[PDB]
Amino acid sequence: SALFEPYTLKDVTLRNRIAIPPMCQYMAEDGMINDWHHVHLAGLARGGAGLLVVEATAVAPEGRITPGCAGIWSDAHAQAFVPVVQAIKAAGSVPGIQIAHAGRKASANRPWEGDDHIAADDTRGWETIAPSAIAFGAHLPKVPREMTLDDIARVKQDFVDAARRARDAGFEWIELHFAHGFLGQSFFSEHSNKRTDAYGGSFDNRSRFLLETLAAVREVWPENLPLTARFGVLEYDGRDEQTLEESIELARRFKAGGLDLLSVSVGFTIPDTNIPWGPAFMGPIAERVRREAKLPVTSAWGFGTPQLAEAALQANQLDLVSVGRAHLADPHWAYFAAKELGVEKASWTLPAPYAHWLE
Amino acid sequence: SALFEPYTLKDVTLRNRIAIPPMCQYMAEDGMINDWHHVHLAGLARGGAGLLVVEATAVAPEGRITPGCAGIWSDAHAQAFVPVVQAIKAAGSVPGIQIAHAGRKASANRPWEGDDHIAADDTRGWETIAPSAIAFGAHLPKVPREMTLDDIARVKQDFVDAARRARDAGFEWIELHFAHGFLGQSFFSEHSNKRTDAYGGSFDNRSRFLLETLAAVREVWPENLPLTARFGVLEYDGRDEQTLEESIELARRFKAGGLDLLSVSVGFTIPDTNIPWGPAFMGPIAERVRREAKLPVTSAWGFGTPQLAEAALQANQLDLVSVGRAHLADPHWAYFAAKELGVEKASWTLPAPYAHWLE
Numbered sequence: 001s002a003l004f005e006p007y008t009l010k011d012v013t014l015r016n017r018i019a020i021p022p023m024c025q026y027m028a029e030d031g032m033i034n035d036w037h038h039v040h041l042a043g044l045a046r047g048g049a050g051l052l053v054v055e056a057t058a059v060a061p062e063g064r065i066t067p068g069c070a071g072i073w074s075d076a077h078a079q080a081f082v083p084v085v086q087a088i089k090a091a092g093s094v095p096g097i098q099i100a101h102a103g104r105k106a107s108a109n110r111p112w113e114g115d116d117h118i119a120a121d122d123t124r125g126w127e128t129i130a131p132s133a134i135a136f137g138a139h140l141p142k143v144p145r146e147m148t149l150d151d152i153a154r155v156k157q158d159f160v161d162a163a164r165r166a167r168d169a170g171f172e173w174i175e176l177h178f179a180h181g182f183l184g185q186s187f188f189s190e191h192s193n194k195r196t197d198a199y200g201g202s203f204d205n206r207s208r209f210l211l212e213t214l215a216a217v218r219e220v221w222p223e224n225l226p227l228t229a230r231f232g233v234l235e236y237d238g239r240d241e242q243t244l245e246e247s248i249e250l251a252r253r254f255k256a257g258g259l260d261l262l263s264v265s266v267g268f269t270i271p272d273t274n275i276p277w278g279p280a281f282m283g284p285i286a287e288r289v290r291r292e293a294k295l296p297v298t299s300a301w302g303f304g305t306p307q308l309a310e311a312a313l314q315a316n317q318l319d320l321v322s323v324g325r326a327h328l329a330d331p332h333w334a335y336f337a338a339k340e341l342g343v344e345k346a347s348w349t350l351p352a353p354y355a356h357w358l359e
Numbered sequence: 360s361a362l363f364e365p366y367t368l369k370d371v372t373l374r375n376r377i378a379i380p381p382m383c384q385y386m387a388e389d390g391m392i393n394d395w396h397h398v399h400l401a402g403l404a405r406g407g408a409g410l411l412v413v414e415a416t417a418v419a420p421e422g423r424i425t426p427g428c429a430g431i432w433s434d435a436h437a438q439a440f441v442p443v444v445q446a447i448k449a450a451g452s453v454p455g456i457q458i459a460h461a462g463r464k465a466s467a468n469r470p471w472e473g474d475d476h477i478a479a480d481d482t483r484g485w486e487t488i489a490p491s492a493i494a495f496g497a498h499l500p501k502v503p504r505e506m507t508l509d510d511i512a513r514v515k516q517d518f519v520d521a522a523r524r525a526r527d528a529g530f531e532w533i534e535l536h537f538a539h540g541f542l543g544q545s546f547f548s549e550h551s552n553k554r555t556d557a558y559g560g561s562f563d564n565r566s567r568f569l570l571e572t573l574a575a576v577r578e579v580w581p582e583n584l585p586l587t588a589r590f591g592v593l594e595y596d597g598r599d600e601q602t603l604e605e606s607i608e609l610a611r612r613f614k615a616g617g618l619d620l621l622s623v624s625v626g627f628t629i630p631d632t633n634i635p636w637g638p639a640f641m642g643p644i645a646e647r648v649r650r651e652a653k654l655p656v657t658s659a660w661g662f663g664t665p666q667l668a669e670a671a672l673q674a675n676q677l678d679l680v681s682v683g684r685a686h687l688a689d690p691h692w693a694y695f696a697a698k699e700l701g702v703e704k705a706s707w708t709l710p711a712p713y714a715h716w717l718e
């Protein structure tokens with residue numbers, strides 16, 4: 001089966017094509033991960049997936065989505081990841097991490113605690129920053145502060161420091177979070193970026209924050225380890241063909257700037273959209289980016305059944321299949337998929353103390 | 360549903376009737392558990408089961424089954440459990456532990472490493488002890504050393520020390536492993552016990568090691584925490600009705616000696632047997648012990664589908680349903696069972712960072 005073929009990117013080999021995408025846990029304290037994350041991540045790694053990407057980890061305190069988000073904005077924060085990285089490797093999965101800045105969608109409640117911007121008088125909240133002083137709207141009504149050129153320089157440096165810390169903590173795969181309406185996505189989108197300096201206006205100017213951040217990260221991130229990004233390639237906002245064309249152009253620039261693989265997502269930059277959720281709905285979009293930018297891709301948002309995952313790979317829509325919620329339901333989903341696809345010795349997707357008994 | 364009704368025994372309340380029975384992992388080193396066990400057990404606890412019983416943990420080095428078995432024969436061994444107990448409690452499951460001595464079935468290879476007695480010239484092996492110098496046979500051909508009265512006193516004291524250490528490590532539930540052909544079961548069975556002193560011959564003498572060990576453990580184990588045992592009530596050796604009658608008599612003695620619940624199993628005392636494996640096959644046997652000894656019971660060996668578990672409880676065959684291998688396959692099996700049985704808000708069988716997304 002295609003799903004259980006190994007994949008090599010730079011010097012890293014994944015044992016199969018199942019990727020666990022970044023999934024926020026909302027269980028950190030002042031950015032510091034703890035035994036929630038250790039057991040969560042080590043358990044997933046033992047479940048058989050080839051790649052495990054740690055949840056959006058903030059490059060700066062104000063770039064957390066919520067008061068429970070993980071951070072890597074100091075050396076102490078980075079050191080907290082070391083035992084988890086070591087546990088993921090011990091299980092034979094490749095440890096990755098998504099580094100992030102939530103921009104105007106920061107300073108929000110946990111999703112089971114309102115999912116909305118934190119109240120003005122709640123001591124947990126903070127001022128958000130963004131390319132322009134324009135609120136997302138709906139449940140995220142707070143108007144962000146318009147970034148200065150010095151803010152831009154500082155956030156880029158925070159991404160560099162974060163990548164350096166990730167490298168030194170032992171991660172073998174990094175993902176820049178330029179999607180889901182967060183800081184990077186919001187610099188790219190005309191909906192959120194109304195700047196009239198070098199970082200707004202034209203396609204080149206809107207792309208600038210993202211391309212400079214990639215180039216700056218590339219300086220510290222090892223050339224033999226995959227350098228990836230997540231990017232929302234359309235919004236379902238009635239501007240899809242022109243947005244996809246620009247997104248594909250940006251993907252070509254990413255590739256030329258050393259990007260090894262693109263995680264293709266939706267923008268979520270604004271609330272007034274009509275996203276056609278359904279099984280594997282991103283497949284054709286991912287395929288188009290893969291073909292037109294000539295870049296490996298992954299995607300998510302409905303590939304979490306074994307036959308869907310297998311079909312997407314065989315059709316060359318995707319190079320890796322990201323499976324998120326099914327792994328929350330069953331951390332051993334890779335074993336389930338191996339069984340479902342009729343893979344030989346499917347139980348040995350799991351480590352011996354499980355596999356021997358399940359044969 | 361019955362499966363998701365809480366259960367109270369002494370001062371301990373289980374959130375549902377799903378018990379994860381002891382399952383050896385074969386991953387300890389000189390008895391010391393490690394991050395294999397920590398993540399394994401904490402992950403299971405988060406999966407929703409009401410009770411998680413840690414694998415057979417040796418009261419003495421020679422009472423390990425294998426070189427990978429856990430031990431609690433020193434204070435350092437006990438202290439290693441403390442962070443795991445704390446993680447199980449944090450997840451809302453009740454931490455239990457099975458304390459054990461493998462008797463003539465000790466000094467064996469891991470099941471995926473031959474599953475047989477260790478070779479005479481392998482530096483990892485050791486002399487086994489038993490009521491009588493008689494080998495199990497088949498894949499376990501080593502003849503054990505016949506225990507002296509001082510050996511008996513010493514092993515009883517090892518069980519006491521183990522229970523004291525379990526208590527002080529924070530366990531809220533203990534299980535004496537008097538089953539599966541190990542030391543305790545082998546004292547009870549006429550197949551393995553040919554002694555002519557106070558510990559062999561008559562029913563009272565064969566029962567003596569088990570009853571004295573229970574009474575000795577009871578002295579140190581808190582009266583407000585469940586005190587349980589696993590016991591093989593028949594062998595499927597052509598002597599079933601007489602063996603079950605004696606086993607039920609022993610269960611009555613256990614109850615009179617402060618046993619709160621009996622895990623009903625098969626003996627596995629000798630290899631020449633004909634066990635009728637099948638779904639829920641132990642149900643009627645467990646029900647008979649429950650009724651005739653008037654003692655709460657659990658059992659296992661084929662209850663691992665949600666409808667089977669629910670039926671066994673509704674029929675009052677069992678008080679708790681032990682589900683083993685299905686939890687190795689899917690550590691979130693309790694969530695799966697909740698969904699299958701149509702339990703309201705089934706995803707909240709899991710903690711918030713999973714449940715919110717699976718609703």
Ligand SMILES: Cc1cc2c(cc1C)N(C[C@H](O)[C@H](O)[C@H](O)COP(=O)(O)O)c1[nH]c(=O)[nH]c(=O)c1N2
Nearest residue numbers: 021022023024055056300301302304323324325716
């Ligand atoms: C709990 C959890 C939390 C997150 C996510 C999701 C969920 C379920 N998602 C999106 C996620 O990576 C994925 O795209 C979706 O889960 C869709 O894939 P599935 O359909 O779930 O397989 C997500 N995406 C991301 O880029 N960074 C993150 O940290 C998060 N946070």
Ligand SMILES: Cc1cc2c(cc1C)N(C[C@H](O)[C@H](O)[C@H](O)COP(=O)(O)O)c1[nH]c(=O)[nH]c(=O)c1N2
Nearest residue numbers: 357380381382383414415659660661663682683684
């Ligand atoms: C990997 C593993 C290891 C063990 C077990 C089993 C397995 C699968 N079993 C037996 C176990 O508790 C249970 O009785 C069986 O697994 C049958 O129940 P299921 O059919 O698997 O639900 C077991 N029993 C026991 O009393 N102490 C133990 O430590 C072990 N070791």
